[PDB]
Amino acid sequence: SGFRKMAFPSGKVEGCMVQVTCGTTTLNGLWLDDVVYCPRHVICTSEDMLNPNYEDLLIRKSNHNFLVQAGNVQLRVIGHSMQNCVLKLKVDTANPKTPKYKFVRIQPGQTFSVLACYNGSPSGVYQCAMRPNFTIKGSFLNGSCGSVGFNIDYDCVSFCYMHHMELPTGVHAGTDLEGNFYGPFVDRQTAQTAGTDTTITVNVLAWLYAAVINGDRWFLNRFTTTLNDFNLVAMKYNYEPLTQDHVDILGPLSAQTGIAVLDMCASLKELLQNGMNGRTILGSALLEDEFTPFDVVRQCSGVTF
Amino acid sequence: SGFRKMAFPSGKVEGCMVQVTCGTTTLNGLWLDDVVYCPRHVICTSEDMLNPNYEDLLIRKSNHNFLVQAGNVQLRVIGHSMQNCVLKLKVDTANPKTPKYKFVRIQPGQTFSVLACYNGSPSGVYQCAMRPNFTIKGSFLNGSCGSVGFNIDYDCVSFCYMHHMELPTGVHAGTDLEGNFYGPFVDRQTAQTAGTDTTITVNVLAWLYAAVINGDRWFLNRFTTTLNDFNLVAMKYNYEPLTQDHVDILGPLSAQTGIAVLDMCASLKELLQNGMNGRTILGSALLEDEFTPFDVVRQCS
Ligand SMILES: *C(=N)[C@H](C[C@@H]1CCNC1=O)NC(=O)[C@@H]1[C@@H]2[C@H](CN1C(=O)[C@@H](NC(=O)C(F)(F)F)C(C)(C)C)C2(C)C
Ligand SMILES: *C(=N)[C@H](C[C@@H]1CCNC1=O)NC(=O)[C@@H]1[C@@H]2[C@H](CN1C(=O)[C@@H](NC(=O)C(F)(F)F)C(C)(C)C)C2(C)C
């Protein structure tokens, strides 16, 4: 028993992290086969980050302008190209540690593990959710850029996130591994703000299931609700609408606990109205929304990689 | 910016995890050079669990009674010895993935990462703290035994915990890597209860210092306290007594913020007195006690 914010094992991704230097800018790169991926803003000088012309800056640089270090070994860059907001450096050597991998774009509410790195060196791993406003509540200091988010499914690493920037509100913004930003952000030192966030309702319900599975039952009540009645109340409290998709996805947990989803919706509705009345759920005084249904079944079933 | 409960990268420990089987019992082992370390209770049957005579069970074992399996490879056991509650299997292959390592015994309030494993395969990694009552609030199912807790310092892995059992309150007990239990627990399936748990006061203060560094001051007050008056109040909320040692440890955070340790103690008294009144500190509506003074300086500016 027990319930923790649990990250994927980072071993396969630690094998891929390199240091990328262009002039005075150092940050992190992802070395897969004979390409290194990193944020395109590595080419920017102080003056440039305000209104950079990336295509302009890029064409003016020789391969030797990119210093790529895998531990003590310098990699020789034999090509460079842009793809949206990620720079792709072609190197002479395939990464012998390249895992089975895929680039995947994730939906809001979906969780991943972040491997925080500094000078191409893995520092820490944590579990995140893509917020509905396309930000992540990360922990990133100077030099964190190029740090990646991933999921594992058997032996396949799904890279979903590369870190680019921090928003003034202390939350974080980045791209998929094809350089497409998550959310309405641009890689420029101009002023940007995260939209107002909402709570991932399907994730809160999965976390209440995890509570019941661990013997925390006090919030269960005799009632049932409907999606409409639940969703009408939910919107009020800035809660994502619960779609029928969501109700089907909880089916395993519902069947495994004996608590039907629309019964659990009535328990969550009451929690939104009255709060938790000086009580905790799994030692939390807040309603936790960074666990997916699949995260709950995986931790509670002991799925390995 | 940001403040996350963060674990160490698990790669160096993943490289060391194996499956250890003895009779019908399978759990996880830790393979370092030519020794596999695992919980000695791998040699128990069902019946053996209440009053196992470990010395009696072990003399009856051959090296070839132990199946060790690193991925496909079955390792060959060329020696077995017990040390306290840890079985040590000598094998004929040094682990090539062996990192720089050392074994360390941690004190209550110290944090570490856990690589939860089943059948020598990792399920996931999370961050923990040795509770004052010498338990951990882990996430551990059947077959999790031999999963380890660790810290990483540059490229050196400090192993500090190996998992052995779950107490009736749903909390976890285990040993250092020399096989000595943390706390008064024994590797028998006998009635055992955790002592009443307390909050790790020094960690909460560190976390309040973290909140200030991250720019939140709402909970500061114009008061100070004596160490003694602080502890008299704190204990009424089941907080660990704060020692002069704890005060010395908090020195650097005190300096960085310019807030005296005993002023920060004054804020905690008030918070204990008032709660948070719909507010949060670093995104928590509870006071966080699983960040050490060291963890805060490591993760903050
Ligand atoms: C990459 N190593 C850093 C990571 C930062 C450092 C502090 N926390 C992080 O996540 N990324 C950057 O320096 C990017 C980079 C220019 C500006 N930038 C920022 O993160 C800045 N943010 C913004 O300009 C804002 F708010 F508009 F999003 C900063 C103010 C320094 C936090 C570029 C090219 C976007
Ligand atoms: C190792 N794979 C398990 C890990 C357990 C299983 C459930 N969650 C865990 O952390 N270890 C054990 O099964 C140990 C083992 C015998 C009994 N045991 C227990 O964890 C049991 N608890 C106790 O005996 C108690 F309460 F005293 F700690 C159990 C009832 C199965 C939870 C030995 C040798 C202690």
Residue numbers in the entry:
A (entry chain B): 1 to 305
B (entry chain A): 1 to 301
Paper text:
The SARS-CoV-2 Main protease (Mpro) or 3C-like protease (3CLpro) is a dimeric cysteine protease responsible for the cleavage of the viral polyproteins 1a and 1ab in 11 sites, including its own N and C terminal. Mpro substrate recognition has unique features and is specific for Gln residue at P1, hydrophobic residues at P2, and small side chains such as Ser and Ala at P1’. The absence of similar sites in human proteases together with the importance of the enzyme for the viral replication makes Mpro a primary target for antiviral discovery and development. Herein, we evaluated the effect of single mutations in the active site of Mpro from circulating polymorphisms on the kinetics and inhibitory constants of nirmatrelvir and ensitrelvir.
For nirmatrelvir complexes, we determined the crystals structures of the WT enzyme, as well as M49I, N142S, G143S, Q189K, A193T, and A193S mutants at 2.1, 1.9, 1.8, 1.6, 2.4, 2.5, and 1.9-Å resolution, respectively. For both crystal structures with mutations of residue 193, A193S and A193T, even though being the most distant mutations of the active site, the additional steric volume and polar features of the serine and threonine side chains caused a displacement in the ligand binding mode in comparison with the binding mode to the WT. The binding modes of nirmatrelvir to both A193S and A193T mutants were similar, but the displacement is more severe in A193S, causing the disruption of pyrrolidone hydrogen bound with E166. The structure of A193T and A193S mutants showed that the increased steric volume and polar features of the side chains caused a displacement of the inhibitor related to the WT. More distant mutations affecting subsites P3-P4 small residues, such as A191T, A191V, A193T, and A193S (but not A193V) have shown significantly increased Ki values for nirmatrelvir when compared with P1 and P2 mutations. Mutants N142D, R188S, A191V, A193S, and A193T showed modest diminished inhibitory constants for nirmatrelvir, with 2- to 3-fold increase in Ki values relative to the WT. Mutants N142S, R188S, A191V, A193S, and A193T showed similar relative catalytic efficiencies to the WT.
